[PDB]
Amino acid sequence: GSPGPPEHVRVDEITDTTAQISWQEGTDNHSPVTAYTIQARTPFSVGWQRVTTVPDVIDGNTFTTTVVDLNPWVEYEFRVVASNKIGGGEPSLPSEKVRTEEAVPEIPPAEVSGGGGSRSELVITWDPIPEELQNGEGFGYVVAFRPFGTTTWIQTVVTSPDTPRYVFRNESILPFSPYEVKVGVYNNKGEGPFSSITTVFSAEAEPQIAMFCGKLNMHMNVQNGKWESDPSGTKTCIDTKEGILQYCQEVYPELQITNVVEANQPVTIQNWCKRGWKQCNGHPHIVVPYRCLVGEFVSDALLVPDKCKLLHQERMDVCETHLHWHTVAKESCSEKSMNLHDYGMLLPCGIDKFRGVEFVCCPLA
Amino acid sequence: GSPGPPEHVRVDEITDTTAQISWQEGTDNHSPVTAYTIQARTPFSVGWQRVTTVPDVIDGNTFTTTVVDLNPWVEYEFRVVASNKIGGGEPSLPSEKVRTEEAVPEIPPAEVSGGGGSRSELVITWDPIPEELQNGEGFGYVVAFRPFGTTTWIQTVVTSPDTPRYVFRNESILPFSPYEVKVGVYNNKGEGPFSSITTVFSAEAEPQIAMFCGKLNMHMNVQNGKWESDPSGTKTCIDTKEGILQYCQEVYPELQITNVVEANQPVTIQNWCKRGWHPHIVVPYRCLVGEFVSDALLVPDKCKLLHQERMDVCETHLHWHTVAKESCSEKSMNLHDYGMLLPCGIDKFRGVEFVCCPLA
C-alpha cells in the first residue's frame, strides 16, 4: 500500500527566497518510505505545485529540507507527500500559512505607452504590476518623461500600485510633441529597475489663496494670473486648515477642492485691503500661499537636471505637516552634501497632512 | 499639415527577432518632422501595430533603426510613419514581406493535465501550441512522465503539433496511481523548455503477428495473451511488407490496422503447426492500430534522449536502428532503446527516437 500522509508539517527559518520545512513520517503501509516531495500553494498558483528543494532529492531518513526559489512577499502553504516502492501516497495536511520576507521589486511595468488628452497635456499609461510581483508593502511607480533632445528629466512618484496612468498638465507642452518616457518601480525595501525608454506623444495660473491677518484674503485668478481681493468684503485670515479648505471652495466654486497645501516658495503681494475694501494701501506683504488642490490627489512633477538625483520617502506610521517633510527633504540632501532643488508631498492622510515626501537633490558649484 | 509618407523603405539584417529598417523623408508640409514610428503587420497581428526599436526613440533626423522583440519564423510587413506639430502623418507604403529566421520554441504547452482511461493506462493531455508560437518547422512535443516520488523519466516524442494526447499503456501502471508529468516543445532548430510538473493520476497484450516459413503464421490473442495459430489454417510466411499488413488486418478484423513495424526484440513461440493444422525464436511484426503513437522510452539518470526527423528520407526499421546506434557511438555512449517516428509508408519511417546511455 501507498504511504500515509506525513504529519505536523511546520515552517521555520523563512526568508525572502528560501524556507525551512520539517515534517514527521506518517503511517507507512508495511513498506519503508523511500522519498519525500514538497508542494506549495499560494493565492496565485492554481492549486498545489511542486517546489525546488536543497538537496534536490529527499530520502526517507530525512525530515527537514530547504525550499528555494520562492517569490518574496507571497503567502505560502506547504505540504509533504511521501513515496513507497508501491507509489506516491496521500499528501499531508497543509502547513500554517506563512508569508515570505520582502525584497526589492525586479519587474518594471510592461506596455509603457500613452497619448491623447486635451491641449497642453501628456498622457502616460502603463500596465499595473500585479500583487505577486510587488515583493513588499509600499509598492509604487516612478514616472519619468522629457522632450526629445533634452537632458533634464521630469519625474513624479505614484504611490498607488493600481494606478495605470499619469497626466502631466503644463503650458510647457507643445502640440503633438514627442517625449522620452520610462516608468520604474519601488517598494519599502528599495528601488527597482526602470522600463526601457519609449516614445509617447503629447496631445494635439493655479488655484491659490493668500492671507495676511488684518487684510482681506487674496486669491489667484486662474484666468489672468493676477492676485485678486476677496469676492466678498469680509473674509479675513483663517485660523484652521479646514477653514482654508472652505475658502478655497468658496472662491473657486466651479472646482472640486479636496485638500490644501502650502506652496514651496513665498510670493510678494502688493495691494492688500481691509474689510469692505477700505484703506487699500500699496504696502507689500511676503506670504506663503495655500494651494487649493483639486479632485483626486496627484503628486507634483519635479525637474531632475543632469547629475541630480530623485529621492522619495513614505512612512505609514507618520502623518505630518508640509513643514515637517520640507525639513526631511532638506536634511536628507545635506547628508549627501547636496542642495534641495524641488520637492512635493506624497500620500495625504488629512487636510494638509501627508505621510511622505518626494524631492530632488543636486550638487553645488 | 501632417507630414507626408516616407519613401525608400528597406528591410535588412533579418534575424530571428531583429530587423534593420531604413527609410527616406517625404515632404514635411512646412513643419519639420520630429519623430518616426515603425509599424508591422503579420498574419497574427490585428492590423498594423507599433513595434519596439533600439533605441525606442527615433528623432526627425534619424533614418535607420533596429526593430527588436520580433516573433521568429513569422512573415512581417513594415511601414514608417512620420510626425510633426500637427500630428501623425500618412504611413509609408509597406515594405516587402519578410520572414524572420527560425529559433527554438520558447512557450511550453499550458493546461497540462490528464486522467481516466482503461486499466493499466495513464492518459496525458495538454493544449497544443498554435503555429504563432512554434518558431520553426518540425515543431513537436516531448512528453515525460514518472511514478510520483521517483527521479527517472519515461519520455516519448510527439511529432505532430496538433496532437494533444498521449496514452501510456504498460503492465507496470498501478490502478489510480499518482504520476509526475511534464510536456516540452522542440523544433528543427533545437529543444525548447518543459512545462511545470503536474500530478496526473492513472486510471482505475499487443496485437502482432509472427512468421516462420514452412509453418502456419502465429498471432497474439489479445484476450488471453497467448500465441495462436492461423485461424484460416492456410496462410504461410509472407515476403512483402504490404502482405504482412493485409495479414494483420485479416487476423484482427475488429481493429483498424494502419501500419506494421518490426519488433525491437525477438520472441520465443511454441506450438507451430503445418498447413491445415518445438519452439522457434522469431522477430514478430507489430500490427499498428489507428493513428501513429510513438513508443515510450526510459531515460535513466545520466542518459540523454535524442530524436531525429529527416523529411528527405523514408527508410526502414533497420536503417533507423543503425542511425540510433551510430549516433550514440559518436557520442561515446551506447544505444539503450529506440522507436520509429513519422511513418511515410508501410514499414517505412522518416525518423527515430532513441536513448543513449553511458557504457557503464
Author numbering:
A (entry chain A): 496 to 699, 1030 to 1190
B (entry chain B): 496 to 699, 1030 to 1102, 1108 to 1190
How did the manuscript describe this experimental structure?
Contactins (CNTNs) are neural cell adhesion molecules that encode axon-target specificity during the patterning of the vertebrate visual and olfactory systems. Because CNTNs are tethered to the plasma membrane by a glycosylphosphatidylinositol anchor, they lack an intracellular region to communicate across the membrane. Instead, they form coreceptor complexes with distinct transmembrane proteins to transmit signals inside the cell. Finally, structural analyses of five CNTN–amyloid pairs indicate that these proteins interact through a conserved interface involving the second fibronectin type III repeat of CNTNs and the copper-binding domain of amyloid proteins.
In addition, complexes formed by chicken CNTN3(FN1–FN3) and APP(E1) also proved recalcitrant to crystallization. To resolve this issue, we designed a fusion protein of CNTN3 and APP, speculating that it might yield suitable crystals. We thus fused chicken CNTN3 to APP by inserting a GGGSGGGS linker between the C terminus of the FN2 repeat of CNTN3 and the N terminus of the E1 domain of chicken APP. This chimeric protein crystallized readily, and we refined the structure of the CNTN3–APP fusion to 2.75 Å (Rwork/Rfree = 0.197/0.231). Overall, the binding sites identified in the structures of the CNTN5–APP complex and the CNTN3–APP fusion protein are similar to the one identified in CNTN4–APP structure. Residue H137 in APP contacts Y681 in CNTN3 (Y853 in CNTN5), and its side chain forms a hydrogen bond with the carboxylate group of E686 (D858 in CNTN5). H137 also packs against V652 in CNTN3, as is observed at the CNTN4–APP interface. In the CNTN3–APP structure, we observed a hydrogen bond between the hydroxyl group of Y681, which hydrogen bonds with E139. At the CNTN3–APP interface, residue T651 forms a hydrogen bond with S124. This contact is identical to the T751–S124 hydrogen bond observed in the CNTN4–APP complex.
